[model samples]
Structure formats: C-alpha cells, structure tokens
Target: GSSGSSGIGDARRAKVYGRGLSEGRTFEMSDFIVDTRDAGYGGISLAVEGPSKVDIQTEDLEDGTCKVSYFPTVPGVYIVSTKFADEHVPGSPFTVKISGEGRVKSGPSSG
Candidate 1:
C-alpha cells in the first residue's frame, strides 16, 4: 500500500510491500492494497515485468483506498511496480514480489 499528498506545504510519500507467494498453487492478487492521502489528486497504478507475462496497467484508485489483482500465466519471479501520485509529483513507489506456480489453469480469471 502507499500514502502521499500533493500541494504547497503539504507533500508526502510512502509505500508498503506484500508478502511473497509459494509455488504449486494459484496466487490471488486481491490481498494487495494501495493507498494515498487526501487533498488534491491521488491514484494507483500497477505493472509486471518477467517471464510469466503478467501485465497490470495503471488504474485510478480512491484517494485513500484501492485494491488491485492479477494472475501469472507461467511460473517464475515477477516484479510488480506500483506508483502513487497527486496533482504535483509522483508519491510512493512500491514493488511487489510474485512467484507463480508452473501449473496453468483453464478458463478466464476475474480481476
């Protein structure tokens, strides 16, 4: 999760990381949370880079509450980057460690 603010004499930034996942099972991304302070503009965005091919685009979240989810197609080490920003500059920068299982499931998954 993250917290921050933007404005004259009121700027801040912070971020929190999630626990790592184990192998041989599906890892639900719902547990992730990103937050930001009030008074101006606040948003959360996610991105993944690794061999698993999991991708999360930048998404606008509530000023102080936001949740995002994602599933990896392949099993490997993956990096999830989250950025929070206000009206002026970017705030907290977060990195989520993800380790997916080698098993591939059928059908589509919800976000």
Candidate 2:
C-alpha cells in the first residue's frame, strides 16, 4: 500500500507479497518503500478533469502495477489524466490539489 510517496524523507518500512488483481485474495501489495523513485509505466488510463467530486478506484498490481485511489469531494483544480497505451505518461496532465485546497488551514498536509 505504498501510495506514491514522493517525499524527501518518508516511511522506512516494508515486507510484502501480492496477488489480488481485483484486490480480493490477500491483496498485500508489497510496500517495500524507497519513497517512490519513479516506477516506470506504459499502457494505462485514469481521468479526472476539473471541478472535483472525485470517485476514482483503479487497481491492478503486480506486473505493470497500478493502484490509484480517491476519496475526494470537491476542493479545487484537478486535471489528473494518465493514459499510456497511446503514450502520455510523462506527467500526463497531473495537476491535482484537493482537501481544503489553496489552504489557509488548520493541520495535516502531505502530498
């Protein structure tokens, strides 16, 4: 469950084994962390254009692994697109900013 942590100094914990395409049978998804140092990709799709009311869930790990989740409910600018089957994965339209976006907030923040 390594949720794409592109951090400076992040989680240093791991130990995993996976096999649950539809996330069914013991979908452990090995989270052997290194803070996500570019995990190559090709052939894919995920779209969410503006005006967020996000409800995204795409999973298919192990071999061209992928698992993009969302529990967002309208905050701000979101044009997150990623389609690889026809090439577009080099920062393919990813401009997401949610959860009290453009903040003047109270607490907690980690992208």
Candidate 3:
C-alpha cells in the first residue's frame, strides 16, 4: 500500500524525508525508508538513542532506495536520527515511543 513518484533531477539538490516510515503498528521495533535515489549512493546512516544503544541497520536496495530499521530490546522513548553523506535529512531526528513505559515518574528528579 505504498506509492510514490521519482522525479528525476539533480542529485545534490535532492532532500530526504520519511516516505515508508511512520509504520509497523504491531512491531516492537519498526522499519522505515527514505528516498535516496537522487541523494547518491552509500553513506546512509541511522542512529537510535534512548535507554540503551540500539543498533540500526541500513541497506541500499537495487531500486535505489535506502531502508533503515532497528530492533530495541529495551522499551523507552527513542530518537531515530538519519543522515546521508554526513548530512541529516529534513526530518532527521524523529521521536519514537516503544512498548510500555511503565509508570510515569511525576517530575524531574534525576539527570
């Protein structure tokens, strides 16, 4: 149920954004995609930061798109940071709520 058009243009002029993201409803850890065809090859990176370090896997498809996915064993709010050629995309840092958060701890107590 995914669809999009590739408007061929200058590669450097290209900008990445969440296309196949905002998904995986039933998954504790979800996958997302960014349109990087016009953004050139390789150098695609993803980082997840939260309660613990989560390893993010990046793969370049033959179709010229990049897939960024992760599997988090610990449940907590995480930030999915994306970059291409060392430059962050438009929605580079995205907030994610994973699994149960247990009980809300009233206010700030510790750093």
Candidate 4:
C-alpha cells in the first residue's frame, strides 16, 4: 500500500525513507535517512516548513548517506522539500505528521 509519508524515490537516483515522516515527538529529534548513492554528493538539500518553528540539520556519514534531523516545536502537518542537484527528488514535498504534548492521550469513543 502507498502511504503519504513514504518518501521512496526512484531507485536509480535516491531513496528517502524514515520514521520521522509518519510521526515525531515535539521538542525532540526527528530524523530521517537519505541515500545519495546515485545522486552523488554534489548538491543535497532539505527544507521543512510547518505550523510551528523548527530547526533542520543534516549529518553526512561520508558514505553516500545523510542523516536529516529536526526539532519540532508543535504538532501538525509539516512540508518537507528534498532536493538533489537543484532538482526536486521523486518525493520532493512530503507531508509529515507530528504529535506533541498538547495532544490528548485518551482513546476516543462514539457517543
């Protein structure tokens, strides 16, 4: 089944997949993995925009892979734009679901 959070791109170019897309805690480290084997290390960039403020950081392993980390402030939908060589990746803009402390933990029931 195809999920909206899945960032799986063209196998020939890059592979973007990680748990951060599905859900992430607030004020914590939300990380995702990006494989740039075929894309090369020329230009790899990422942009995240959401309701609340956030900080995005990238860690290069120096092995055709990069670790993208971000600290989410609030909970909501966040737009993730991943670019390679100044071009949008297969799944350039990704929708992320974030859960924060303000969320209710109780289960919902029909009245």
Candidate 5:
C-alpha cells in the first residue's frame, strides 16, 4: 500500500496488490482496486507498459477501485509497469509470463 499525492480534494490514499502471473490466452484483469476510499483524490492517471504488440490499459474507478488489463499477441516474457503522478506506484513494475507452447495469463493480477 502507498499514499498518493496530496491533491486539492478529499485526502485520498490507495491499497494496491499484485497476484503475479500464471497461464492464459490473454493476460486480463479488472481487479487492481485502487482503493481511494479516503476522498480528496480526483483527476489522476494510471499507466501500463508492455511489449510492442501488447496493448496495456488501465483506468481509475469511482468505486474506490481500478481496472487494468493486458493483451499479449505472442507468448513470451514481458515487463509491465504502473505509475501515477509520474511516480511508480506500490507495484512499480511486474514480470509477466506467457507460455510459448501453451496459452498463458496473468493475474486478477493487475499488471
């Protein structure tokens, strides 16, 4: 868990968790719950980084949670990173695994 920027609103904080990687056809997750339960947090951005073909997506939720997804075109190892306020969040980066011989997937996992 980490405290975010002290902005101009309800004093917002966050609780983030990473489940690591597993096996799947696509590494997708919507459970990166960025619990901004405190208040004072408004207008911020979360970023996801990965391979060239992979499309990394992330969104901050209004229900004190966040949604994050990962789509990899090929099987391999990828480096995914998350950040907000230009600062690496609790889980700055993640190492994702995709099976070359079989389908692979990451976590609820939140890349």
Candidate 6:
C-alpha cells in the first residue's frame, strides 16, 4: 500500500464507512506519496466511477491528503479510482471497492 515518488504520477482510492451507518460511506483518494525529492514535481488526482457518480481532484503541496464523499440515493456497489503524476516519472493508477449495507440501531439495555 506504499511506493516511492515516481517522476510521472501515483494515485489511490478506497471506500470508507461511517462509524454507525452501514449504508453511509464515502470514497477516498490520494497519492501514496505527496512530496518528493524534487521540488514542484509531484501531484495527484482522484475520481469515482459508479451509480453514485462522485468525482474529486487535488494537487499535493508537500505530502497532503485529498478525499471525496457521496450520499447514495439508493444502496448499491460503488467503485473509485485515483491517478497521480510527477514531473518525469510515469503515472500510477489504482482502484478501490465500496460495499454498503443497511443496519438497524438498538437502544441501550440494562445489563
């Protein structure tokens, strides 16, 4: 889940779930590495592909994080992809899977 700074670009994306809501989840994307030995030579981009239709893009200043979220109108499967680029290195790409389910909440009971 990690890699060194390439001249081109690197990208990564993943589906994240909320603390309580099963169906409530978000898609996150970012470059494995934001900063590189070369100054002004590294950047990352993010995009989502699914029924949810969520998309995001960002540039790394010095190793920062970028993310995106989508509130599904209906429960279904979602896929996310990320792309990154450097100055002289070839770009890198990756994909993430997002699965959602509904959950019922129960009130606290006496022990």
Best by lDDT: 4
lDDT of 5 at 9: 39
The local distance difference test score of each candidate is 0.44, 0.41, 0.60, 0.76, 0.49, 0.37
lDDT score for candidate 5 against the true structure = 0.49
Worst 10 residues of 5 by lDDT: 22-31
Can you write out model 2's per-residue Cα lDDT over 62-86, one digit (the tens) per residue? 5434556555454556665655435
Candidate 1 lowest-lDDT run of ten: 17-26
lDDT of 4 by residue, 1-111 (tens): 543553434433877888776677778788988888755544666788899878888887777588898998887888888877666777657888887776565558765
The 10-residue segment of model 3 with minimum total lDDT is: 18-27
After superposition on all CA atoms, how large is the RMSD of candidate 1? 9.7
RMSD of each: 9.7, 16.6, 9.4, 9.5, 9.3, 8.9
Indicate whether candidate 4 or candidate 5 has the larger TM-score: 4
lDDT of 3 by residue, 16-106 (tens): 4442244222235577667777665546557777777766777877877867767666666677776666666765466776655434465
Output the lDDT of residue 89, model 6. 24
Off by over 4 Å in 3: 1-27, 101-111
The global Cα lDDT (0 to 1) of model 1 is 0.44
With candidate 6 superimposed using the best TM-score fit, by how many Å does residue 11's alpha carbon deviate from the native? 5.5
Model 4 lDDT, full chain set: 0.76
User: Could you tell me the TM-score of candidate 1?
Assistant: 0.47
Model 6 agreement with the true structure over 48-105: per-residue lDDT tens digits:
4556664444443343433343443333454334333522223322234344443354
TM-scores, in order shown? Answer: 0.47, 0.24, 0.60, 0.73, 0.51, 0.38
- Give the poorly placed runs of model 2, Cα more than 4 Å off: 1-47, 53-60, 75-80, 85-111
Q: Which pairs in model 2 have colliding backbones? A: none
TM-score of 4: 0.73
Q: Candidate 6 overall Cα lDDT vs. reference?
A: 0.37
Q: How close is candidate 6 to the true structure, as a TM-score?
A: 0.38
